[PDB]
């Protein structure tokens, strides 16, 4: 298995200090001699290690959200598929969200939330980077280019919160592959 | 016959076998089967407190993407209902009863055609959107008032024709987009879009769990008279049940009217919706009362019609 998993490191990374990084916890987590020999015989810790390195880039970001936070974002992409650039406002989300809700009860008991509360959920979604602002250069390269962006007063804050034209990070079609069919909104991943 | 009819009106699960036995060759689509089953029998048309007859019939129109099983219902109605005339629609005055001359007196006679051939039945028009403007305004002139008028050679004659239009339509591009409303995608004017009690929109995608069952049902149907298609009971008692429910004539109560005003407010809160959709759900209420064979209607059976209107 150790020879098997080194082959994976040859494939994607093909760089030794990446693999060299993995062994350092694997040889310090043992407490007696015989456990260490089984560890390099099993290499199951490398699975847990590659789990943790993966656990919150994009997928575990998605798995660790509640029922509403999925339902907002699922509506957020179904609006995003309609326009040509894919941009969508908060009112188009909410309207879409409401329309989506007006289908689950009629086909059957689910608390439809208000306007004044979705903003609190909408705050975490933009800082979970599932959305982006439409024209926002994220990080400047050096210091004096960033300092030239600090003095610049902006126009997007001067339009209100519910009209900052948010665009999409994770497209609608890819949501169907990650969201299991056991969830009720699986009919909404596909259009 | 009465021993089978009295046995079939004393149980409680008749309607659930009726919605899956009105079209045994079609997999899925219970709402379309519900509207097709309630569109065979109407109700409460009688006479208005003044002296004019109202539209007591159910109009059913099916829309959706290409290559579906929605024409199969079209092929079933005409093979099962005796009062059923089918037309291709694209290849169609004839629809609204055309005029032809006789040489004795050079006098006109009115041929029913698609529109007046059926009596207390279902006239089914496939491909409703490739028709012209003249036959569609003749259908609209035949639908505002339950009558058809023929004006030819100086004489004017109108007559009572009762029909339930089963209109099969398709979009302008074929694929149904959820981007906009029904009006811009159906591509027909408002008046001819009105006086329709129920619309059935069918959209398809890749959902393997029901798709494999649909493909297995399609390949299992392709054999010599399979039992897979078989319904819980045949059409032998269903024809006399349709006739027995047809001669019933039921009526509404006060609790149903008090729930109906709130249901009309709930349907208008979604906003076009006017008096015609209210008349369509009122006519569907006595049809579901006749199908479940209950005289004085309770609002719990009208709640399923409210859910059917909410499902559309």
């Amino acid at each position: 298995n150790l020879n098997r998993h080194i082959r994976m490191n040859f494939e994607t990374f093909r760089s030794l200090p990446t693999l060299k990084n993995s062994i350092i916890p694997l040889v310090a987590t043992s407490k007696n001699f015989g456990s260490l020999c089984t560890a390099i015989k099993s290499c199951s810790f490398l699975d847990i290690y590659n789990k943790n390195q993966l656990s919150n880039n994009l997928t575990g970001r998605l798995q660790s959200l509640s029922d509403l936070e999925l339902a907002i974002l699922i509506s957020a992409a179904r609006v995003a598929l309609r326009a040509k650039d894919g941009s969508f406002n908060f009112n188009l989300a909410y309207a879409e969200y409401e329309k989506m809700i007006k289908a689950i009860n009629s086909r059957i008991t689910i608390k439809l939330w208000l306007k004044k509360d979705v903003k609190n959920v909408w705050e975490n979604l933009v800082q979970l980077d599932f959305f982006t602002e439409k024209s926002a250069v994220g990080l400047r390269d050096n210091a004096t280019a960033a300092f030239y962006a600090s003095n610049y007063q902006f126009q997007g804050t001067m339009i209100p919160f519910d009209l900052r034209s948010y665009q999409m990070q994770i497209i609608l079609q890819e949501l169907r592959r990650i969201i299991p069919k056991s969830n009720m909104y699986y009919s909404w991943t596909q259009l | 016959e009465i021993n089978e009819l009295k046995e079939m009106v004393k149980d409680e699960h008749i309607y659930d076998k009726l919605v899956r036995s009105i079209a045994p060759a079609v997999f899925g689509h219970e709402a379309v089967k519900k509207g097709i089953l309630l569109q065979m029998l109407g109700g409460v048309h009688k006479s208005t407190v003044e002296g004019i007859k109202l539209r007591g019939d159910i109009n059913i129109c099916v829309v959706g993407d290409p290559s579906t099983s929605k024409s199969q219902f079209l092929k079933y109605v005409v093979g099962f209902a005796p009062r059923s005339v089918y037309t291709s629609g694209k290849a169609s005055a004839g629809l609204t009863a055309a005029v032809v001359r006789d040489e004795e007196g050079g006098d006109y006679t009115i041929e029913a055609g698609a529109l007046m051939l059926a009596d207390n039945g279902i006239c089914c028009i496939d491909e409703f959107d490739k028709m012209d403007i003249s036959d569609q305004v003749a259908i609209h002139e035949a639908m505002e008032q339950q009558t058809i008028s023929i004006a030819k050679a100086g004489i004017h004659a109108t007559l009572n024709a009762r029909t339930s239009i089963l209109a099969a339509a398709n979009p302008v591009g074929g694929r149904y987009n959820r981007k906009l409303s029904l009006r811009g995608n159906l591509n027909m004017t408002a008046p001819i879009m009105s006086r329709f009690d129920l619309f059935f929109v069918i959209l398809d995608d890749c959902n393997e769990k029901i798709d494999t069952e649909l493909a297995s049902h399609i390949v299992d149907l392709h054999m010599k008279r399979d039992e897979a298609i078989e319904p819980p009971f045949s059409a032998e008692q269903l024809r006399r049940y349709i006739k027995y429910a047809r001669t019933f004539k039921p009526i509404l109560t006060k609790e149903a009217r008090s729930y109906l005003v709130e249901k009309y407010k709930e349907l208008r809160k979604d906003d076009r919706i006017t008096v015609r959709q209210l008349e369509s759900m009122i006519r569907l209420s006595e049809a579901i009362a006749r199908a479940n064979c209950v005289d004085e209607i309770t609002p719990s059976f009208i709640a399923e019609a409210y859910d059917l209107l909410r499902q559309s």
Side-chain angles (χ1 to χ4, degrees), chain A residues 1-78 80-95 97-98 100-111 113-114 116-151 153-191, chain B residues 1-38 40-46 49 51-52 56-64 66 68-74 76-84 86-87 89 91-94 97-103 105-110 112-114 118 120-140 142-143 147-149 151 153-161 163-191 193-194 196 198-205 207-221 223-224 228-229 231-245 247-250 253-256 258-262 264-265 268-271 273-274 277 281 285-289 291-293 295-305 307-308 311-312:
Chain A
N1 281 331
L2 178 56
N3 210 297
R4 185 172 48 90
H5 282 227
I6 281 180
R7 186 153 293 105
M8 297 176 182
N9 191 92
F10 175 57
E11 285 307 304
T12 59
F13 298 100
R14 206 169 293 198
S15 54
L16 203 51
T18 47
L19 195 165
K20 187 207 313 158
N21 167 229
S22 279
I23 310 300
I24 317 163
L26 199 144
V27 303
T29 186
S30 169
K31 285 303 148 290
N32 78 95
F33 172 73
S35 62
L36 196 137
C37 312
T38 53
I40 70 159
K41 256 173 188 159
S42 69
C43 295
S44 158
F45 177 75
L46 198 149
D47 283 18
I48 319 161
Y49 180 65
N50 262 326
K51 164 151 199 40
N52 190 82
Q53 297 288 97
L54 187 48
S55 294
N56 50 320
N57 48 359
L58 182 61
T59 294
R61 294 206 274 176
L62 201 70
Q63 293 175 9
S64 42
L65 302 183
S66 316
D67 53 83
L68 176 68
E69 317 174 284
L70 269 52
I72 296 184
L73 193 149
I74 278 155
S75 47
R78 276 171 99 262
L81 209 49
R82 308 205 202 281
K84 304 298 165 291
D85 45 15
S87 48
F88 65 101
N89 300 114
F90 182 46
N91 289 136
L92 295 198
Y94 176 77
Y97 166 67
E98 181 176 352
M100 182 175 58
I101 292 305
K102 294 176 65 58
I104 297 302
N105 323 294
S106 43
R107 74 188 276 264
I108 290 172
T109 178
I110 285 305
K111 175 184 274 195
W113 293 81
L114 309 101
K116 61 183 279 188
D117 44 0
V118 174
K119 166 191 188 298
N120 202 12
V121 185
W122 187 270
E123 174 273 350
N124 277 310
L125 285 176
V126 59
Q127 67 170 351
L128 259 178
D129 287 28
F130 281 138
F131 310 122
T132 58
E133 206 273 333
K134 166 71 194 329
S135 71
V137 175
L139 299 192
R140 266 85 199 165
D141 52 64
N142 75 324
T144 189
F147 171 59
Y148 282 162
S150 45
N151 59 74
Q153 195 271 318
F154 307 110
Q155 287 312 119
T157 308
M158 294 316 132
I159 68 172
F161 145 77
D162 40 357
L163 266 302
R164 299 189 210 90
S165 59
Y166 275 139
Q167 281 212 335
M168 188 56 71
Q169 173 98 15
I170 187 167
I171 214 62
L172 178 53
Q173 190 35 70
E174 299 277 303
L175 314 173
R176 184 157 192 83
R177 209 157 67 253
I178 171 63
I179 292 170
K181 74 193 62 53
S182 64
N183 177 271
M184 47 188 164
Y185 318 134
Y186 188 77
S187 42
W188 305 108
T189 75
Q190 189 198 20
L191 300 101
Chain B
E1 295 91 4
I2 201 171
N3 276 327
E4 189 47 60
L5 278 180
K6 282 310 282 206
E7 188 197 0
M8 86 169 302
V9 295
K10 279 302 179 191
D11 310 351
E12 77 271 1
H13 285 169
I14 309 111
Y15 188 70
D16 292 348
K17 314 268 190 169
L18 270 177
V19 294
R20 69 195 189 124
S21 76
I22 203 60
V26 193
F27 180 73
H29 316 283
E30 292 181 354
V32 193
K33 281 159 184 162
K34 265 188 282 183
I36 276 157
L37 171 69
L38 288 176
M40 299 178 56
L41 77 171
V44 105
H45 55 86
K46 307 205 306 286
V49 64
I52 50 164
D57 215 345
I58 305 280
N59 310 300
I60 290 291
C61 46
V62 281
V63 281
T68 45
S69 181
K70 73 182 183 182
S71 169
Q72 291 201 356
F73 303 105
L74 176 80
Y76 195 81
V77 170
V78 77
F80 162 70
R83 266 88 166 269
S84 53
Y86 154 73
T87 182
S92 72
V99 171
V100 67
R101 303 290 187 91
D102 200 7
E103 63 276 9
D107 192 300
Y108 70 86
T109 180
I110 314 287
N120 317 4
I122 306 179
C123 167
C124 38
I125 315 179
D126 191 5
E127 206 58 41
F128 204 80
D129 285 335
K130 294 292 184 182
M131 307 195 314
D132 297 342
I133 321 174
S134 65
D135 49 350
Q136 88 199 350
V137 298
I139 278 169
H140 184 49
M143 292 323 314
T147 180
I148 41 166
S149 66
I155 69 169
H156 286 199
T158 180
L159 60 104
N160 176 4
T163 44
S164 65
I165 319 174
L166 194 141
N170 292 318
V172 61
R175 305 270 310 162
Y176 187 78
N177 41 4
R178 293 182 183 174
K179 56 173 61 180
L180 295 174
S181 69
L182 181 134
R183 173 74 163 88
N185 211 352
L186 196 38
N187 205 4
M188 48 192 262
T189 187
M193 200 189 67
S194 65
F196 267 103
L198 201 40
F199 279 75
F200 295 128
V201 189
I202 295 176
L203 191 140
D204 294 335
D205 45 349
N207 314 311
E208 294 94 343
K209 183 178 179 180
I210 50 167
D211 185 80
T212 41
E213 193 172 348
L214 183 131
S216 72
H217 164 263
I218 278 171
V219 77
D220 274 328
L221 168 62
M223 74 101 64
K224 203 183 204 182
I229 52 178
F233 61 98
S234 70
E236 196 258 340
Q237 57 170 317
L238 202 144
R239 291 188 301 272
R240 53 196 80 251
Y241 187 49
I242 275 181
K243 289 308 284 184
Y244 180 70
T247 174
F248 198 70
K249 311 298 289 295
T253 68
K254 312 172 198 283
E255 188 63 43
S258 70
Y259 196 69
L260 195 136
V261 52
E262 205 49 59
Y264 181 64
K265 193 250 158 183
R268 226 165 74 180
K269 207 188 166 294
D270 303 326
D271 290 326
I273 302 304
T274 59
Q277 301 277 128
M281 63 100 81
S285 69
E286 288 103 16
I288 212 169
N292 282 333
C293 296
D295 187 8
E296 283 168 352
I297 198 63
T298 67
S300 175
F301 287 163
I302 322 176
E304 298 286 328
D307 289 326
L308 185 51
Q311 204 196 356
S312 179

